[PDB]
RNA sequence: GUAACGCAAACAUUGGUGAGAAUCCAAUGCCCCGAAAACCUAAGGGUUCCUCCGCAAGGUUCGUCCACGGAGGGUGAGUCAGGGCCUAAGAUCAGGCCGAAAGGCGUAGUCGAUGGACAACAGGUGAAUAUUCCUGUACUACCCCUUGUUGGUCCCGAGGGACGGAGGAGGCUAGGUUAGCCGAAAGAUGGUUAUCGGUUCAAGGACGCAAGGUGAAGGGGUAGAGAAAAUGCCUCGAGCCAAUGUUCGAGUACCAGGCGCUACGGCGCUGAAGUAACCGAUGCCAUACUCCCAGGAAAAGCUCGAACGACCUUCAACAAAAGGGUACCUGUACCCGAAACCGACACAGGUAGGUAGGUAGAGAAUACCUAGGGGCGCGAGACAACUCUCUCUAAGGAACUCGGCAAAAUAGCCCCGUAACUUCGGGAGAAGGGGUGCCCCCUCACAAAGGGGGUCGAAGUGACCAGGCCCGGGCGACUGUUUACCAAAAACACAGGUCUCCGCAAAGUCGUAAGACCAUGUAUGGGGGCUGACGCCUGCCC
RNA sequence: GUGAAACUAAGUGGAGGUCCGAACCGACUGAUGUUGAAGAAUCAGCGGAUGAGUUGUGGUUAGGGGUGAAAUGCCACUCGA
RNA sequence: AUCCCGUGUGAAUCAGCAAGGACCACCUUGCAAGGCUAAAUACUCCUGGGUGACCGAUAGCGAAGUAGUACCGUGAGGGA
RNA sequence: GAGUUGAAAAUAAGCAGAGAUCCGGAGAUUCCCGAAUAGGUCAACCUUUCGAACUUCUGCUGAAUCCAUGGGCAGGCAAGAGACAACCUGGCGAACUGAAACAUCUUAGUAGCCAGAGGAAAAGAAAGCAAAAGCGAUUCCCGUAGUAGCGGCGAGCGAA
């Protein structure tokens, strides 16, 4: 195993300056990092699954592949798959669960994942547990995809995608059950707004118990949370997006 | 390239003359001296052997808290430190 | 009580104190270099207290 | 000339020293500490350590004494600790980007142990050091020489180093106890030897593993860009892995006790027995086993190895063998549960780690003790009020008072017994009762058992130690957190719920910028608002 | 005990922000202390005490700031700057 | 007005260009978009020479003594 | 040109008319730290291969592409770096205060920080003044004058 490397960034709520920009982090448990090939760019080399194991750094499980020529890679476990199953990346290849193939040659309407937005990079979309995309159409240079959010988006057709839904569908059936469970998961407590003083947070102060008194529900930094968009405006990708979410 | 720090020909300041040193001459067959603070064991053994033409089983050194290095220079079973030190005015 | 109170000092290694306030620290920073200017100007005997030798007698290994 | 003289462990006497002694030294009593008030370390102090002298000042009194003043001394290392090796958090950052200047980001590297990697033990000695000096017996790294192979060396591609918590059983030892063996023995009193002591030995070398665990540990060739990892072949006195143990180390010492010193300290000669049984660790096996999920550092040293690319190359590089020969820097004193650090004080305070004896006990609690260390730097009387720290109290038993605040009572173990309600886990040690000392007995296996019988006291967990319990309501579900130095809660958090934003060059956040977090994550994810387990719910108004 | 599940009696097992209780960490009540022995202590009791646990070493965050299970609390006996 | 600047525009060449406190005409003055240059002027950590209706140890420099010392502060710093 | 071997002043041994001690000018040495510079560091130490590190000078080389640039190896007395009371040039640039409050305004382009250099620095040889009369690069004093002016026409500011 040369894929399981202890090379954390450490602290990991703190920026370059050294201030807590991303809030409610720390405590946690020490964890390692499994590199995962989201590219799956070992082309025309026939592969075999061997073990399904726990990634501490994810929702979904990881799958250890042994290739025919004799090298090993970690990937995302698809839903139906088991130990000793078979896969391959390339152009031709069948549409059997867990195989990798560019979006052009794929069927119309198949549950898929690990999709690139830009050719070359790797695999950004549908990576969580139960992640699932459904190719709706195709148009010239583009393929029209429906995402896990419930949004239809034009992406480039030459881009890669791995067939099958992503496994471990039941991780919504946790109850955690106690403060301590979320504490050792990495997260930390979240102090409400209305509780604090006026100097700290917009809702702050107020004698007795405070109603959220200032006409709007506010962030810590003045910008109305609870209804108000924030998708820049005239962003580069704007053209490509077709729909909303749910 | 020999010395950690180059110092001098000189090095050795003087022998210590006291009641402990006289007894250590008889018991251990060993001389006692004050040297450079920047003096090395290797440097001392090359000096004292090459000076008197005598052998040195071992040197052991310390820095008394003012910052002056004092060295015990031990001699082989062959060479006799009592008679050697007699002809350098310690007896 | 069992936790002592309002002793600002403790017994802490001269390593850490020299890496916080020592000569080599002051000498790096431009702002901090002009503190040594003021110290030599006033003519204070000991410039920056809390300096240690890597060598013996006051070594903090 | 008052308050005070820093705990209520505790002193007394005889002698000595000297101008002078409650206070300095010695002896004898007595008492106190003993998971310390003992002995070691890390940090920090910074000469306080030892010797001889002094007592103006300092020491809450005195003082011939001192952590005080003067004078002189004292810290010895290949193996202990660090550095000459390695890297984490973090730091600095060549070129590079960004910024009025100062500078900011950031890769290659380089630093940076609290971690990895590495070689020593006993006995001895001495005013002050000892794993450092001495004696014995060891080990690591280099330079000789006998065999060798033809290249080495670095870069470089691999193996490996290499890692969690919890729990439990087994095998061992360290340590303890008892016996045996040996030596000594009047301790003035009815008896009595039943008494008192000693019975010790490390590192390392050589060598084997059991009803301890397991039943591939460890290899050898081969294909395919392939020397390692990986797809198929075979083979294993079917066995391995270890802590302990047998020996040498160690016919040596070490040694209880005897036989002589001469004045205030140890020191010469001698030298018996040196075993067994049981209890037994939080120590080792064990980076072992099982279980669990929150999924448990890196880098060098080490071992392979084939390349390519460089150097160093035939007075040479790598392997093995006994015997030789060789051996850098710094720390080392002393205090370190404190009169020496940190608290302005010789301050009732704080301060990381190590070693853990006996009797009673479940126990690192407690009580009394051992080894070891101490009697708290004002004393002497007297025995008024009053205050404090305590001990008891006839009759009553909350009548006190803002309030049972405070005090009292309960208490260990074994056996019987245990309600409403319930989220079916609880409530619950519910409540409430009975037995416990000491002696003597039944049993081819019930930690003074269990049971039977006796005997003593007013009282049997007799001391220390060691739950008070119940019924009803508000708030918050719950363990948790909070105003250091007046507020610990009903306040915050919490699992759960809901809304809203965000499709990745993401929203958000921090920055003049570069860019950083988010995330090496990508909608079962990430940011924000409110509510606060769980049950039933959550209406009208745009 | 079942078509098999379900369910239920005994063993085994060692979970738990489980219980009682030293060290450890805290700070609820009282008494004492108030030109204190102490610029927050002593004493007698108290809560947690395998976890959201305690703590040594070495680091990080900086005042139009930081940090904050949120009191305007803490940031060297200083904090509405 | 004159002088200098970000943004955008954008001339002319001595029948020229600019100034003469918007602006135009006529006069007068000068030659912008390249550089260099002593003096008179400013000051005292300091050296030499002189002077004082200046101080004389609570004054005069903080500092007449081995003072930025002793001491305090984590530190900048304060300070006999 | 006569006694000396620093201050406090004591001893011990020396050096001195063949001219010391001293005074002046010029040279030589100058451990370690510090711009610090062989590399590291917790200033005054540790490791070395014993080295001015880094940049522009100057000799050769030879990247991704011909040339070229980056880069590597050499020689180099080798120019630069840091320090410095005030004065000065340039960059950034306050607030208290005054206006009896306060925002224009004033405090002020002052204090502060940052960078730079000299004995001064900056300025400076007319695309300038001025008025039909003339002057001839700067800079500083007297003056014009608290005048012309500007100004919530307020406080104030104030030329040539």
From Swiss-Prot, chain A:
Under Gene3D superfamilies, the record lists: 2.30.30.30, Nucleic acid-binding proteins, Ribosomal protein L2, domain 3
Query: What is known about what this protein does?
Result: Component of the chloroplast ribosome (chloro-ribosome), a dedicated translation machinery responsible for the synthesis of chloroplast genome-encoded proteins, including proteins of the transcription and translation machinery and components of the photosynthetic apparatus.
Q: How does it assemble?
A: Component of the chloroplast large ribosomal subunit (LSU). Mature 70S chloroplast ribosomes of higher plants consist of a small (30S) and a large (50S) subunit. The 30S small subunit contains 1 molecule of ribosomal RNA (16S rRNA) and 24 different proteins. The 50S large subunit contains 3 rRNA molecules (23S, 5S and 4.5S rRNA) and 33 different proteins.
Q: Name one GO cellular component term.
A: chloroplast
PROSITE patterns noted in UniProt = RIBOSOMAL_L2
Which protein, by its recorded name, is this? Large ribosomal subunit protein uL2cz/uL2cy
Annotated family: Belongs to the universal ribosomal protein uL2 family.
Q: Where is this region: Disordered?
A: 195-246
Q: What does the UniProt entry say about where the protein is found?
A: Plastid, Chloroplast
User: What processes does the entry annotate via GO biological process terms?
Assistant: mitochondrial translation
**Main subcellular location:** plastid
What GO terms are given for molecular function?
RNA binding; rRNA binding; structural constituent of ribosome; transferase activity
Sorted alphabetically, the keyword list is: Chloroplast, Methylation, Plastid, Ribonucleoprotein, Ribosomal protein
Fetch the SMART domains from UniProt: Ribosomal_L2, Ribosomal_L2_C
NCBIfam families linked to this entry = rplB_bact (TIGR01171)
Curated annotation (Swiss-Prot), chain B:
Q: What is the lineage of its organism?
A: Eukaryota, Viridiplantae, Streptophyta, Embryophyta, Tracheophyta
Instruction: Kindly list the places in or outside the cell where this protein is found, as annotated in its UniProt entry.
Output: Plastid, Chloroplast
Q: State what this protein does.
A: Component of the chloroplast ribosome (chloro-ribosome), a dedicated translation machinery responsible for the synthesis of chloroplast genome-encoded proteins, including proteins of the transcription and translation machinery and components of the photosynthetic apparatus.
What's this protein's name? Large ribosomal subunit protein uL23c
Report where the shown chain sits in the full-length sequence: first residue, last residue, total length: 104 to 194 of 198
Disulfide topology:
none
Source species, domain of life:
Eukaryota
Q: Mention any additional remark.
A: Two forms of the protein exist; they have the same N-terminal sequence and approximately the same molecular weight.
Question: Per the similarity annotation, which family is this?
Answer: Belongs to the universal ribosomal protein uL23 family.
Query: Its quaternary structure?
Result: Component of the chloroplast large ribosomal subunit (LSU). Mature 70S chloroplast ribosomes of higher plants consist of a small (30S) and a large (50S) subunit. The 30S small subunit contains 1 molecule of ribosomal RNA (16S rRNA) and 24 different proteins. The 50S large subunit contains 3 rRNA molecules (23S, 5S and 4.5S rRNA) and 33 different proteins.
UniProtKB/Swiss-Prot annotation, chain C:
Question: Which species expresses this protein natively?
Answer: Spinacia oleracea (Spinach)
Give the record's family classification.
Belongs to the bacterial ribosomal protein bL34 family.
- Write the protein's name: Large ribosomal subunit protein bL34c
Functionally, this protein is described as follows: Component of the chloroplast ribosome (chloro-ribosome), a dedicated translation machinery responsible for the synthesis of chloroplast genome-encoded proteins, including proteins of the transcription and translation machinery and components of the photosynthetic apparatus.
- Transmembrane segments annotated in the record for this chain: none
Task: Tell me the subunit arrangement.
Answer: Component of the chloroplast large ribosomal subunit (LSU). Mature 70S chloroplast ribosomes of higher plants consist of a small (30S) and a large (50S) subunit. The 30S small subunit contains 1 molecule of ribosomal RNA (16S rRNA) and 24 different proteins. The 50S large subunit contains 3 rRNA molecules (23S, 5S and 4.5S rRNA) and 33 different proteins.
> Which compartments is it annotated to reside in?
Plastid, Chloroplast
Which portion of the complete protein is shown here? 92 to 152 of 152
